Amino acid sequence: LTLQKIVETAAEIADANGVQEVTLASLAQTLGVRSPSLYNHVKGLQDVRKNLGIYGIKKLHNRLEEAAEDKRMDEAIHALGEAYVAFVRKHPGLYEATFLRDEEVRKAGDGIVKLCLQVLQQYGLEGENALHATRGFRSICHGFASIEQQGGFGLPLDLDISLHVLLETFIKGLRE
Amino acid sequence: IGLTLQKIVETAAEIADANGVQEVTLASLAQTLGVRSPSLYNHVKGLQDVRKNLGIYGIKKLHNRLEEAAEDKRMDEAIHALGEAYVAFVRKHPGLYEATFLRDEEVRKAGDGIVKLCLQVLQQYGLEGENALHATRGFRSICHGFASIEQQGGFGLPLDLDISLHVLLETFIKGLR
Numbered sequence: 077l078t079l080q081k082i083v084e085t086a087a088e089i090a091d092a093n094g095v096q097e098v099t100l101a102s103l104a105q106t107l108g109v110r111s112p113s114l115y116n117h118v119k120g121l122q123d124v125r126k127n128l129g130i131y132g133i134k135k136l137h138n139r140l141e142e143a144a145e146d147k148r149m150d151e152a153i154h155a156l157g158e159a160y161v162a163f164v165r166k167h168p169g170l171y172e173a174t175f176l177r178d179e180e181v182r183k184a185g186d187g188i189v190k191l192c193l194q195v196l197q198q199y200g201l202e203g204e205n206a207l208h209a210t211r212g213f214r215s216i217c218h219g220f221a222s223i224e225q226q227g228g229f230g231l232p233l234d235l236d237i238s239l240h241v242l243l244e245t246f247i248k249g250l251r252e
Numbered sequence: 253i254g255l256t257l258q259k260i261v262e263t264a265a266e267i268a269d270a271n272g273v274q275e276v277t278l279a280s281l282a283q284t285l286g287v288r289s290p291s292l293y294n295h296v297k298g299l300q301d302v303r304k305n306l307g308i309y310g311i312k313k314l315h316n317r318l319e320e321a322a323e324d325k326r327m328d329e330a331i332h333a334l335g336e337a338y339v340a341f342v343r344k345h346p347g348l349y350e351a352t353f354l355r356d357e358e359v360r361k362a363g364d365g366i367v368k369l370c371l372q373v374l375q376q377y378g379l380e381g382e383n384a385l386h387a388t389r390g391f392r393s394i395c396h397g398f399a400s401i402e403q404q405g406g407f408g409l410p411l412d413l414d415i416s417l418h419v420l421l422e423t424f425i426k427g428l429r
Contacts (some may be wrong), residue, residue, distance in 0.1 A: 212419065219397020220397070222400055241383070249427030
């Protein structure tokens with residue numbers, strides 16, 4: 077039993093059943109262990125949620141780094157957006173956990189902002205425009221993934237095409 | 253003021269905005285109205301019916317703010333006014349906006365007016381049919397994503413939020429043109 081095992085279990089419960097289904101009893105039950113032993117690693121349920129949020133955002137970051145590896149500019153942006161949305165599709169509970177209003181959860185997302193900013197600086201932008209563009213890119217990916225997840229894209233059109241079109245429009249606007 | 257469906261819906265809206273859509277129940281409705289639970293059944297079938305009517309009301313309220321914002325504006329002026337109005341609605345009505353996502357045909361149907369408005373502006377850039385439809389999704393994604401992140405407190409950078417939103421709108425517009 078480690079903090080990591082506990083957190084990986086919380087992740088599977090969260091994706092399959094909803095993040096609100098993560099409890100110490102459900103974790104102990106699933107790991108086949110007595111619940112008091114969880115307290116050698118976590119302070120309680122809120123502490124579990126914190127760690128789950130940090131784990132989620134690190135796993136997202138890993139997917140994004142992988143997708144963008146040895147790609148530049150347009151290909152990197154497309155692969156980043158695609159991987160962002162794929163992450164939300166397959167890990168809804170883990171993704172939801174990254175939005176815990178906790179300063180450690182927030183800070184663990186900094187590698188994602190840096191990666192985005194690094195790719196966006198390849199576009200040779202003025203003043204603060206690199207910095208606005210990271211908010212822009214994050215808004216696009218969260219926006220698309222969130223509407224799609226909630227069933228708000230009712231039109232018959234292919235969603236993978238729609239995402240590609242949105243990313244291309246963003247890229248075109250960055251190029252001028 | 254005798255009890256009506258519209259009052260029940262307006263009560264649900266205030267509850268949702270204050271405490272979240274999840275706080276909207278027959279019991280919370282009954283207790284805030286100072287009335288009891290069979291009285292609500294004269295006007296609503298039950299909570300799904302409340303949720304549906306709440307979703308329609310919120311969508312209609314959002315649509316109105318957007319129609320007003322875009323009036324006598326075209327192209328860039330319209331896009332900027334539309335996006336600003338969308339996000340402003342989310343800031344002011346977080347729970348009502350959440351309600352508009354109910355998976356129900358009547359709720360979806362009432363949201364067609366917004367998609368139609370966006371499509372009409374995007375066609376001014378010479379976008380046609382299918383590709384214009386892809387662009388509506390993009391614009392909704394931008395507005396929803398920005399507002400949703402702002403609301404969760406996810407914009408930590410010491411950048412002005414009004415500027416960031418409209419810089420994104422500028423970039424989107426340039427990418428259409």
